[PDB]
């Protein structure tokens, strides 16, 4: 799914598989997309801040866009970088 | 002690009060924006962690 | 040199020094608890520092 | 133990282990529990000061509470995080 | 107009003229003090960056 | 040596080391002393003053004498603490 997470809070869980507890900042929103399991999309921005800063599995750095609005990553199917799409590319 | 200085000094304290303050809202827009990019790397860290343990990332 | 003049300059001597400074005791309590912040966070930097040439903490 | 430290002091050194040197600042006071060794619980009060913030080994964020009397937190047995306590969970 | 306004003039005067004005010697060395402060504090900076570049300190 | 510097000035250089250009404040006398490399000593003291601030390697704050003639910190010959000596230890 696409369980947000903000402050402190748990993530993933689903299939009797066990849950790892992520803490963030004070009060910085996280948008987490796990899929089946293989990959991992990870999303972050602050509520008083003008950049969405996000990243994935496959890719090597992270990739941000100022519009605080550009949705999120998807979990990746195989290998599939997120760095060049229309929503980022906006290289750090 | 003479109205003459009193007014002078009037005058340079609204002088002195209309100096330009640096600009505060993008000063701490610079710490939040970092705050969020340290929370983003240590999420990366913690879900590379957890495919430690298990062969498989949350969810 | 005329006695209207001297107490028009006591009467804005009196108005000049009745302005409300700002509050300062909350001034200096946020220097204060910036030190205790950094000085936790060593803390805890220097705690982990021995954690690396030993295998536990102090005591 | 408890062996609190302010200035300049001396932390541990039971069952003739090595001692480190803590030097805090001028006059803010430190309150440490080592336990058996494999947690540490700390906290921090300014003589001067309205807050004491405080954490702990399995913690991932500095916690605070405005009373300046909330004891301090005691080394955790096992992976066991102090924020959320009562006295505690005011989260920075 | 009156020569007993002017002598209350003068009198008033000469009590306005007496007020004892701040010590100002001890309020510039705290100035002083607090850039000497400033400049230590730089100083250990830049020697740390130096110690970058290379590995040994100046000399 | 004792290198000290007023101004703008070099500090270093020996053995045909590269030498770092500090720049003090408008009036501000500093004293150096780099000894062999591994440590360094630093001294403050304005002209018009009332307090010589110092500092070391080792140390982990800056320590003051209200003499403005304590002579300066010379390099600690390894880890080697100089808050607590007779010329200094008025703690910060």
């Given at each position: 799914?696409?369980?947000?997470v903000?402050?402190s809070?748990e993530?993933?869980?689903?299939?009797?598989?066990?849950?790892?507890?992520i803490?963030?900042?004070?009060q910085?929103?996280l948008?987490?997309?796990?899929?089946?399991?293989?990959?991992?999309?990870?999303?972050?921005l602050?509520?008083?801040?003008?950049?969405?800063?996000?990243?994935?599995?496959?890719?090597?750095?992270?990739?941000?866009?100022d519009?605080?609005?550009?949705?999120a990553?998807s979990?990746?199917?195989?290998?599939?970088?997120?760095?060049?799409?229309?929503?980022?590319?906006?290289?750090? | 002690?003479?109205?003459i200085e009193?007014?002078?000094?009037?005058?340079?304290?609204?002088?002195?009060?209309?100096?330009?303050?640096?600009?505060?809202?993008?000063y701490?827009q610079?710490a939040?924006?970092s705050?969020?990019?340290?929370?983003?790397?240590?999420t990366?860290?913690?879900?590379?962690?957890?495919?430690?343990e298990h062969?498989?990332?949350?969810?």
């Amino acid at each position: 799914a696409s369980k947000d997470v903000t402050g402190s809070g748990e993530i993933g869980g689903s299939n009797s598989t066990p849950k790892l507890a992520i803490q963030t900042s004070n009060q910085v929103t996280l948008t987490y997309d796990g899929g089946t399991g293989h990959t991992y999309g990870i999303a972050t921005l602050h509520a008083k801040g003008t950049r969405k800063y996000a990243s994935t599995s496959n890719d090597t750095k992270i990739y941000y866009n100022d519009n605080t609005a550009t949705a999120a990553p998807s979990a990746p199917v195989g290998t599939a970088t997120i760095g060049g799409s229309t929503n980022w590319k906006n290289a750090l | 002690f003479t109205l003459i200085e009193l007014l002078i000094v009037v005058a340079i304290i609204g002088i002195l009060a209309a100096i330009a303050i640096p600009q505060f809202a993008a000063y701490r827009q610079k710490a939040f924006n970092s705050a969020a990019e340290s929370d983003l790397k240590n999420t990366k860290t913690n879900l590379e962690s957890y495919y430690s343990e298990h062969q498989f990332y949350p969810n």
